[PDB]
Amino acid sequence: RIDDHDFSMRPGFGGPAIPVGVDVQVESLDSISEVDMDFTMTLYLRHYWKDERLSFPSTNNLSMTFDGRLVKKIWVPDMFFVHSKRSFIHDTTTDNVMLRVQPDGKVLYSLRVTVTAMCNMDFSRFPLDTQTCSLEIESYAYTEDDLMLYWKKGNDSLKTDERISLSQFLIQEFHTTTKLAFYSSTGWYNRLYINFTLRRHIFFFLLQTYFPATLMVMLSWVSFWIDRRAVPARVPLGITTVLTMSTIITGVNASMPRVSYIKAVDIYLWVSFVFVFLSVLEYAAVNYLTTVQERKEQKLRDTHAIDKYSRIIFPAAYILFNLIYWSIFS
Amino acid sequence: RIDDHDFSMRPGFGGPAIPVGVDVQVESLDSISEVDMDFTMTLYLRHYWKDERLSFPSTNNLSMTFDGRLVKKIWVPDMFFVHSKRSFIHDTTTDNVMLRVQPDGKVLYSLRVTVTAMCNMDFSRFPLDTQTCSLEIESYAYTEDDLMLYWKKGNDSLKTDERISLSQFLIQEFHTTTKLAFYSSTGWYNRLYINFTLRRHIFFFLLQTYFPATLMVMLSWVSFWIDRRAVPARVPLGITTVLTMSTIITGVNASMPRVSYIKAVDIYLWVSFVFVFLSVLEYAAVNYLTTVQERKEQKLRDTHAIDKYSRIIFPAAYILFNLIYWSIFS
Amino acid sequence: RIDDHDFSMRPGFGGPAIPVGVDVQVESLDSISEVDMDFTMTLYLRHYWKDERLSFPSTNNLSMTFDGRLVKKIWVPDMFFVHSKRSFIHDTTTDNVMLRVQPDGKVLYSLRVTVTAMCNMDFSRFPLDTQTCSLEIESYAYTEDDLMLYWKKGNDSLKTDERISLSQFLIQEFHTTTKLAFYSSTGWYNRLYINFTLRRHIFFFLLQTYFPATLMVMLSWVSFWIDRRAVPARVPLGITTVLTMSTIITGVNASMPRVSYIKAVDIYLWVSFVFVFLSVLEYAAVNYLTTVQERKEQKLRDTHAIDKYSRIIFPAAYILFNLIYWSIFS
Amino acid sequence: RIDDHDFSMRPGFGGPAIPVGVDVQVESLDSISEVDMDFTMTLYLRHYWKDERLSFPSTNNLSMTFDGRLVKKIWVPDMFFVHSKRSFIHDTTTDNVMLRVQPDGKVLYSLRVTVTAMCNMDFSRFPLDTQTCSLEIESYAYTEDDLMLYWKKGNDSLKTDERISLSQFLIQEFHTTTKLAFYSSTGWYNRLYINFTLRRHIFFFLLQTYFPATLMVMLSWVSFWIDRRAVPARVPLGITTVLTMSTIITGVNASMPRVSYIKAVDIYLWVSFVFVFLSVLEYAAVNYLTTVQERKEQKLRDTHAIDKYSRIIFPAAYILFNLIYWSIFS
Amino acid sequence: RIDDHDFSMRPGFGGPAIPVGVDVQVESLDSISEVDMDFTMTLYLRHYWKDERLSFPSTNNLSMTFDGRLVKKIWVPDMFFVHSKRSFIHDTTTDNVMLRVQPDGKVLYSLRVTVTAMCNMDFSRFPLDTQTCSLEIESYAYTEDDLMLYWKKGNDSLKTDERISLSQFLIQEFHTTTKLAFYSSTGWYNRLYINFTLRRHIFFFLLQTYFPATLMVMLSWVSFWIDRRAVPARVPLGITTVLTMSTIITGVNASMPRVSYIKAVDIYLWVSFVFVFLSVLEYAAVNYLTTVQERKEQKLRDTHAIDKYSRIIFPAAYILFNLIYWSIFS
Ligand SMILES: C=C(C)[C@@H]1[C@H]2OC(=O)[C@@H]1[C@]1(O)C[C@H]3O[C@]34C(=O)O[C@H]2[C@]14C
Ligand SMILES: *[C@@H]1O[C@H](CO)[C@@H](O)[C@H](O)[C@H]1NC(C)=O
Ligand SMILES: *[C@@H]1O[C@H](CO)[C@@H](O)[C@H](O)[C@H]1NC(C)=O
Ligand SMILES: *[C@@H]1O[C@H](CO)[C@@H](O)[C@H](O)[C@H]1NC(C)=O
Ligand SMILES: *[C@@H]1O[C@H](CO)[C@@H](O)[C@H](O)[C@H]1NC(C)=O
Ligand SMILES: *[C@@H]1O[C@H](CO)[C@@H](O)[C@H](O)[C@H]1NC(C)=O
Ligand SMILES: *[C@@H]1O[C@H](CO)[C@@H](O)[C@H](O)[C@H]1NC(C)=O
Ligand SMILES: *[C@@H]1O[C@H](CO)[C@@H](O)[C@H](O)[C@H]1NC(C)=O
Ligand SMILES: *[C@@H]1O[C@H](CO)[C@@H](O)[C@H](O)[C@H]1NC(C)=O
Ligand SMILES: *[C@@H]1O[C@H](CO)[C@@H](O)[C@H](O)[C@H]1NC(C)=O
Ligand SMILES: CCCCCCCC
Ligand SMILES: CCCCCCCC
Ligand SMILES: CCCCCCCC
Ligand SMILES: CCCCCCCC
Ligand SMILES: CCCCCC
Ligand SMILES: CCCCCC
Ligand SMILES: CCCCCC
Ligand SMILES: CCCCCC
Ligand SMILES: CCCCCC
Ligand SMILES: CCCCCC
Ligand SMILES: CCCCCC
Ligand SMILES: CCCCCC
Ligand SMILES: CCCCCC
Ligand SMILES: CCCCCC
Ligand SMILES: CCCCCC
Ligand SMILES: CCCCCC
Ligand SMILES: CCCCCC
Ligand SMILES: CCCCCC
Ligand SMILES: [Cl-]
Ligand SMILES: [Cl-]
């Protein structure tokens, strides 16, 4: 009896709020953006409510599935995703819409959607960071006085596919919560949350960034073991180490997020750069002192202490730095 | 009585202009494009007007929320964003539209939209710049004689979310204004403005750009303290420092905005490059003078002054440059 | 008699399930993304079923072709692609839809669609890896009690275009299968699968990555055949070889997948890098020992063993590593 | 009286052609793509014509504004942009359409559109080039016998926003013209043209490209003043200068247009590269001659002329090249 | 008399096939993608057929042009592009559709469309390659028994714009062909082909890639003319040349197509790399032999043949390689 009723008014229009239950199955997590600070998810969204205007006579007490072109002729709750950037409903080969109605008016409605939603990421410990994210569901036009939104089975209303995986992150700790939201100009609304945690894998970053910089720092210590008389052997080695470290730094910066603070990897890289710089300065000082001594001996007419002490001081300083660093950012 | 009226005509058609009030809540600022000089904002837009054709009997003077499919059967204000590049209305899971009507005909109409709009950025002080942006709302079809547009609550009609954030900028000073606009061929219209100010964070740029250039300039000064007899040691240091500075400049230029004037960072980088070039020329001059002196000695049959004066002159000049630069731009 | 029936209800509504057969012809395989882990396909999809509501009088028992605007007036199966990211129906110059009806109600329905679908990839043997993929077809609203989905001709139902070719992969082993799916809140559904296997071509990687690293290792081995007394000849060669290998590694990393586990190419490149590093350290040790001996003889007042042994030891270790590597990874 | 007419037929159907006037205001120039040779423009397009089927009684002879849903119910001129690649009408918060009708049937119709259209470009003088572009408006379905398209006022029909600007170009000389177009299979049509000129800002390219190459040539000239007995000093400087120039050329080539002819900047860069190459060859010749003479003198048992002549010849040749180059391309 | 007919059936439904002629004017060739293997074209597509149901009384025997909203109420041929990736019809400021009807029922129907279509490119001779491409037009629903598709004027039915051009290719030899296509499940269909040939310009590659590799190979040959006693001159030169060649190869490989076989440019580049490698090995051999002879002289107590032989062998071998290469690949 579609044609006999006005479906621009909710069930119970003018009376108490109508309960609407929600059930979600998560299908996949498609991508994460560190410059845009958002994520994309595909899910099946289910609604439960009753409308006495949709009853029909039957002897079986069983639900029937209808084509889905009928959805545009009846009242349907208006859910939307808060703090989202873009979304759409899949529609091949037809709209991905299910409608099942029982003889007493109970309705099950189901959509397949894709949502891109924002989140606040902290990179102060990158690439050792851990992030938390949430997707928020809320009705748009109806306040809690007209429509009451809740999880259909409480904590049991959220399911996930076994094939959910991201190549760069470990996904854990799915759960659901609720909260009441307030708008100064419209009223009070009930929000539903889907929360989860992401843990990044660190092997790639270690192998591609920490390994080369440490190797170049250790290469800069070769200079201390070379006879100081070979100036065109010790100067080129230091300057080439500086050039290699700078090129590595640029190549790494080509792929990094940009924030108003500095990530742990930046601290590591610039400490290595300063170490190489100080090695070059030390050799310059040694050469100057040797020349001065030669001039004084001419006027009057072995390993230099600085080299033999730096051979111990430099490795100790780097080892201490690494101990503190991997005790803090473990 | 939707079917009993013609809603292609405005309320008060043929008579005085109909007042329309506006109220905006800002949800987020998504991105800033320095190449295209624009920004993307998501907001809630609310309209207020009275229409006697939409009155209905009641007892409680309370507004009732209707489905939202009636927005295409009644008259609605026609507003658009001026100097925008693209925009859309969110439509998952349905159109994000609210409609509330009071018994006497007062209407509340609400939309959720995403808009990309342009702004004129001045990069002459980059990366220390400050920009002023604005978003403009105006009616399209109706001049001020047909439609009167104003802020609903004065300067209290703009609200912002606590989660507004940008990774590169600090946002401040949201406020609203009005101004009359004129088109030669159509008439006079009234604009509404939303203004805000953006200030860039500078630590990332300092560490990634200013620090390595200073370090390379300081490394170019070691040549002054090395014995002038070691030509195959002093020449490679200068040419390698020049090469490293060139690679750093290229890597920096890869990510910068292009303008017909110079930004502060380019001034700093090219002054450093000139310093390294001059150091190479100084060693060339010393070598030539030494050779000439030796030739004179042969035909007749200590530290060269240039080095001992350059060791003082170069750091003093660079410090003077840094003082002037960081007093001008700070 | 389109106007005499209600086509919001399936044929057999209230009774046994309606059998629906499926045929597919694959037209092309468009692209593969190793970052988002998906593939794009264009195919022709065909549906077969009977509907006695679509009969008409005739003497020929021959199919008639109808315009295709009639598709939106009649009941049609609602197939969708499981685990897909986006899809669309081509619509130039009109919708690519065919409708062909026999006098007794047998219906042939055909669409041209493009689908992007996700697939999990294992990159541990990259670039020698073999990948498998599948596309899944299922009904959205009807369970196996309402709709019976099957392959129309069993194994003969899948045809492919002669022109299917990807520049990076060899495509083989197309075949089909079926499985029964379950959703905890809706019911049981029958899934159809299209399976295929990809084999990557390896010539490009052999030319671009393995060759330069081997050449650089053999170039670094030159150091052991140069007289050890030429320190400013032997040190620069090693440090420049390290710089070149780092440049090569960065250039290769620019185009490689990022996973938490190590790929074969990364193992090869970093083993080569360590070989060069060890060569530099060996020369440093030789220089130090020579200087120590000279000082000892002065206090008391030919080829060094290490170089002679390294000329044999280094190539043998590299050849053994290569044999192991190419036995493990084929 | 919309419902009493058939609006598939133009006014005057079967008789003389209906005149249509056009007036345009340009709002912005959004972007320019040198790779694809196109530009993006946003404009307001206005149409003027008379249709007596749209008359109505009135007492004040004043134009009235209608909702804009009526455009789809009445006849409208069908203008399109020739040689465009894509376009759209802005539709937030509704279609940006104005419709004003006078009591005697005169109609004003106004659209806000964004068009991307091609502009052919000659890069032979890049980056000192000047380009011209045009946007073309034409009727699709009606020939000059059915529709007469003209500029509503003349040269005064084009207005531009005060804020139109580009980050790379100076915009000048907006004006209009008309021409008659012919299609072999359909007929003759009127075209309207909007013409403008773009001139590039040179400074950025000068500083980023010409300055480094000149500095590197002047650095390669340093070799001529170094004592010819310092072979391990003179060879590295030349080879490192060549490497630096190659790196600069690659970094610049990352950003340049690709055409079948040669741009000016390529001429400058490759001439500089040839100069550095020649400097290296001259040093090689000097060393060979010195060794030959030394061997002859030993068997029998000052500055070399080539160096003293190169010190004069190289700067003079480069200065002559610059004097010619900056005169040809002005 | 639109409402008096059922236009869901083709003209002649139940009888012989209806002839449809096709006429095409090509407006532009917009882009070519070598990574995707496709191209984009904009064209005007014209159809001719007769329909007695569209006859109307008249006195002038002339064509009448209709609005184009009638296309959704009458029967229209269903052409589509085979092996296409995406396409659309331009719709600014309205649908770019023309419809003309003669009194006897003959119809001219015209569309302006943009199509992306695939092409199998062969890059063996890149960048000296020549490619052929085609665009295919076919009906979707009607077999050759129901609809006869043919060129309206034979080979004179294809016209091309005078402004068609591509920056990287020369376009030649537009012509048309036809063929009969078979589908195993549906039937036989007529296809129309639009052919063209593309020739790549090679000046860009000759300047950017071949020239510097030849220059670096010739720079490697300088070492043979340098006194062999200057080891720290001849070793650094070779290693720096190797580094420069590797950087050049990386920079050019950054942008080139990837295939399972080797392109001509990679053959040239890697042969050059091998030449530089062999020069380094030759100098190492010379140094070792000289040291061995000096040791023999010590135990007993001119230019080396290898260098003077290589001064002839290396240039001649490179010349032979170039003569063969430029004779095979033209
Ligand atoms: C630019 C580079 C690679 C380095 C720089 O210093 C080095 O040690 C490298 C070397 O290749 C070897 C040595 O000849 C060099 C020189 O004097 O400066 C340069 C030369 C060319
Ligand atoms: C869901 O989990 C939360 C975790 O804190 C818990 O507080 C809540 O009681 C749980 N609800 C159900 C229904 O299990
Ligand atoms: C509310 O009702 C009172 C009467 O009780 C009336 O005076 C007042 O105008 C009403 N307000 C509105 C906004 O309709
Ligand atoms: C709103 O407040 C701002 C605060 O700076 C003020 O400048 C402006 O004049 C105020 N406008 C009105 C209408 O009160
Ligand atoms: C086709 O016609 C034959 C008679 O020649 C008849 O026996 C058969 O049932 C018909 N088939 C269909 C599908 O109508
Ligand atoms: C049917 O074909 C598929 C193709 O992959 C094959 O796997 C399967 O074994 C075949 N089954 C039979 C019964 O032939
Ligand atoms: C213009 O308007 C005046 C009234 O101001 C009216 O008298 C006159 O007839 C109108 N002219 C036309 C051409 O409509
Ligand atoms: C419009 O003005 C321009 C100004 O340069 C002129 O070139 C052109 O001929 C004028 N056209 C007409 C129609 O007056
Ligand atoms: C040609 O047109 C005239 C009307 O001008 C008409 O009378 C005549 O029948 C037409 N001839 C043909 C062959 O259609
Ligand atoms: C059209 O021209 C092509 C050119 O190759 C030729 O093959 C074909 O036979 C021609 N057809 C006609 C009808 O002239
Ligand atoms: C194989 C990875 C080694 C990483 C070492 C990191 C030392 C800080
Ligand atoms: C044609 C390239 C061959 C590369 C072989 C690499 C062996 C480690
Ligand atoms: C700051 C621009 C310098 C340009 C120098 C050009 C020399 C030919
Ligand atoms: C200006 C183009 C030079 C091309 C040289 C090619 C040498 C093989
Ligand atoms: C800059 C190093 C100088 C050393 C003086 C002892
Ligand atoms: C070498 C540091 C490893 C740290 C692992 C958490
Ligand atoms: C955040 C660092 C600021 C430094 C100002 C001199
Ligand atoms: C404002 C122009 C500055 C140029 C500096 C080289
Ligand atoms: C080219 C500069 C050298 C200076 C010697 C007088
Ligand atoms: C398993 C990690 C190997 C790293 C070799 C450098
Ligand atoms: C790195 C120096 C090696 C010294 C071993 C005796
Ligand atoms: C390679 C240059 C040699 C010069 C002989 C005059
Ligand atoms: C630049 C000074 C040159 C002197 C030549 C004798
Ligand atoms: C240094 C060349 C400047 C040219 C200005 C047009
Ligand atoms: C055509 C490929 C040849 C490869 C030779 C190693
Ligand atoms: C590595 C090549 C050395 C040549 C003398 C055996
Ligand atoms: C002395 C010049 C030899 C040239 C051989 C090609
Ligand atoms: C096709 C021209 C080749 C020129 C090689 C020097
Ligand atoms: Cl580099
Ligand atoms: Cl480099």
Beta carbons of A250 and B192 less than 8 angstroms apart: no
Pairing between β-strand B158-160 and β-strand B18-33 as defined by DSSP bridges: parallel
Across D276-313, b (16+ Cβ under 10 Å) vs e yields bbebbebbbebbeebbeeeeeeeeeeeeeebbeebeee
CA pair distance C229, B179, nearest whole angstrom = 83
Beta carbons of C193 and C135 less than 8 angstroms apart: yes
A230 contacts in C (CB within 8 Å)?
231-232
Residue B235 to chain D, least CA–CA distance (Å): 6
Token pair belonging to C5? 């029936």
CA pair distance E34, E129, nearest whole angstrom = 12
Select from C52, C56, C61 the residue to mutate for testing ligand 5; criterion: most ligand atoms less than 8 Å from CB: C61
Looking from the CA of residue B225, the nearest atom of ligand 15 is: 3
Computed from CA positions of residues A274, A279, A283, A286, in that sequence, does the dihedral angle turn out positive or negative?
A: positive
Q: Is D155 in the pocket of ligand 8 (CB under 6 A)?
A: yes
CA pair distance D291, E230, nearest whole angstrom = 11
Beta carbons of A222 and C281 less than 8 angstroms apart: yes
Beta carbons of E198 and E131 less than 8 angstroms apart: yes
Asked if E28's CB is within 8 angstroms of D118's CB, the reply is yes
CA pair distance C313, D226, nearest whole angstrom = 43
Closest to E123 (Cα-Cα) out of E200, E194, E205, E203: E200
DSSP-derived 3-state class of residue D151: strand
One DSSP character per residue, C250-276 reads: HHHHTTS---SS--HHHHHHHHHHHHH
DSSP A221: T
CA count, 13 A, side-chain hemisphere, A73: 14
CA pair distance B41, B43, nearest whole angstrom = 7
CA pair distance B247, B290, nearest whole angstrom = 33
Across C135-166, b (16+ Cβ under 10 Å) vs e yields bbbbbbbbeeebbbbebbeeeebbbbeeeeeb
Out of D79, D270, D280, the one facing E219 most closely (by C-beta) is D280
Beta carbons of B102 and B52 less than 8 angstroms apart: no
Q: What is the A48 CA–ligand 2 centroid distance (Å)?
A: 21
One DSSP character per residue, D201-246 reads: --HHHIIIIIHHHHHHHHHHGGGGGS-TT-HHHHHHHHHHHHHHHH
Measured in degrees and rounded to the nearest 5, phi and psi for residue B46 equal -120, 140
Query: Is position B110 annotated in a ligand binding site?
Result: yes
Q: Which residues contact B49 (CB under 8 A, 6 or more apart)?
A: B11, B18, B19, B20, B21, B77, B106, B107
Beta carbons of D41 and D112 less than 8 angstroms apart: no
CA distances from E97 to A174, D83, E28, E93, E113 (A): 53, 16, 19, 11, 10
Which residue has 């580009």 as its token pair? D166
Q: Which residues contact C151 (CB under 8 A, 6 or more apart)?
A: C21, C22, C157, C176, C178, C192
Computed from CA positions of residues E205, E207, E212, E214, in that sequence, does the dihedral angle turn out positive or negative?
A: positive
Measured in degrees and rounded to the nearest 5, phi and psi for residue D163 equal -95, 10
Residue E7 to chain C, least CA–CA distance (Å): 8
The amino acid that residue B163 corresponds to is R
Q: CA-based Rg of chain E, rounded to a whole angstrom?
A: 33
DSSP-derived 3-state class of residue D306: helix
Q: What is the resolution of this structure in A?
A: 2.9
CA pair distance C224, A320, nearest whole angstrom = 36
CA pair distance B265, B128, nearest whole angstrom = 10
Compare all CA atoms of chain D with the CA of E95 and give the residue at the minimum distance: D78
D203 contacts in B (CB within 8 Å)?
260-262
Measured in degrees and rounded to the nearest 5, phi and psi for residue E308 equal -70, -30
Q: Which chains touch A (3 or more CB pairs under 8 A)?
A: B, C
Beta carbons of B51 and B108 less than 8 angstroms apart: no
CA distances from A315 to A132, A227, D23 (A): 39, 19, 78
Please give the annotated binding residues of A for 4-aminobutanoate, written as ranges. 46, 110, 138
Looking from the CA of residue D207, the nearest atom of ligand 13 is: 2
CA count, 13 A, side-chain hemisphere, E199: 8
DSSP-derived 3-state class of residue B156: helix
CA pair distance A164, A173, nearest whole angstrom = 13
CA pair distance B11, B17, nearest whole angstrom = 9
CA pair distance C219, C204, nearest whole angstrom = 23
Chain A with chain C: Cβ pairs closer than 8 A: 145
Beta carbons of B8 and B230 less than 8 angstroms apart: no
Asked if A284's CB is within 8 angstroms of B167's CB, the reply is no
Beta carbons of C147 and C191 less than 8 angstroms apart: no
CA pair distance C157, C193, nearest whole angstrom = 12
Select from E206, E208, E218, E325 the residue to mutate for testing ligand 14; criterion: most ligand atoms less than 8 Å from CB: E206
H or E element, residue E277? helix E264-300
Which residue has 């012509």 as its token pair? E175
Task: Check residue D242 and give left, alpha or beta (phi > 0: left; psi -120 to 50: alpha).
Answer: alpha
DSSP-derived 3-state class of residue B158: strand
CA pair distance B114, D71, nearest whole angstrom = 26
| Probe site for chain E from C93, C115, C205 (most E CB atoms < 10 A) | C93
The amino acid that residue E293 corresponds to is Q
| Distance from chain centroid for Cα C119 | 8
CA pair distance D43, D27, nearest whole angstrom = 5
Compare all CA atoms of chain E with the CA of D251 and give the residue at the minimum distance: E251
Q: Is C222 in the pocket of ligand 26 (CB under 6 A)?
A: yes
Closest to E165 (Cα-Cα) out of E134, E206, E201, E115: E201
CA pair distance B37, C312, nearest whole angstrom = 63
CA pair distance D292, D304, nearest whole angstrom = 13
CA pair distance C106, C56, nearest whole angstrom = 11
Report the C-alpha dihedral over residues A23, A28, A31, A34, rounded to 10 degrees: 50
CA pair distance C235, A219, nearest whole angstrom = 12
DSSP-derived 3-state class of residue C99: strand
CA distances from A25 to A45, A174, C174 (A): 7, 12, 31
Closest to D197 (Cα-Cα) out of D248, D121, D269, D117: D121
* Neighbour count for residue D172 (Cβ, 10 Å): 10
CA pair distance A129, A263, nearest whole angstrom = 10
Closest to B17 (Cα-Cα) out of B194, B185, B184, B141: B141
Q: Which residues contact E291 (CB under 8 A, 6 or more apart)?
A: C227
CA distances from E37 to E87, E117, E196, E212 (A): 16, 9, 15, 30
Residues with their C more than 2.5 Å from the N of the next written residue in chain E, i.e. before a break, are 301
Token pair belonging to E45? 């597509």
The amino acid that residue A283 corresponds to is Y
| Probe site for chain A from B62, B87, B94, B253 (most A CB atoms < 10 A) | B94
CA distances from B34 to A255, B258, C321, D171 (A): 19, 9, 50, 20
Pairing between β-strand D18-33 and β-strand D158-160 as defined by DSSP bridges: parallel
Cis upstream peptide for E176 (omega within 30°): no
CA pair distance D62, B143, nearest whole angstrom = 14
H or E element, residue E291? helix E264-300
Closest to E308 (Cα-Cα) out of E290, E275, E282: E282
CA pair distance D181, A213, nearest whole angstrom = 67
CA angle C77, C80, C86 (to 5 degrees): 145
Cis upstream peptide for D103 (omega within 30°): no
The amino acid that residue D324 corresponds to is I
CA pair distance A202, D15, nearest whole angstrom = 78
Question: Whose CA is closest to atom 6 on ligand 20?
Answer: C270
Across B159-168, b (16+ Cβ under 10 Å) vs e yields ebeeeeebbe
Closest to E118 (Cα-Cα) out of B128, C167, A291, C324: C167
Beta carbons of C204 and E259 less than 8 angstroms apart: yes
* Neighbour count for residue D194 (Cβ, 10 Å): 20
Query: How many residues in chain A?
Result: 330
Asked if A262's CB is within 8 angstroms of B203's CB, the reply is yes
Task: Check residue D12 and give left, alpha or beta (phi > 0: left; psi -120 to 50: alpha).
Answer: left
Q: Is A231 in the pocket of ligand 11 (CB under 6 A)?
A: no
Helices (H) and strands (E) in chain C, counts: 5, 12
CA pair distance B220, B314, nearest whole angstrom = 10
CA pair distance A234, B226, nearest whole angstrom = 12
Strands (E), B97-139: 97-101, 106-118, 130-139
Pairing between β-strand E64-66 and β-strand D187-200 as defined by DSSP bridges: unpaired
One DSSP character per residue, D175-191 reads: EEEEEEEEETTTEEEEE
CA pair distance C269, C212, nearest whole angstrom = 10
Measured in degrees and rounded to the nearest 5, phi and psi for residue D47 equal -120, 145
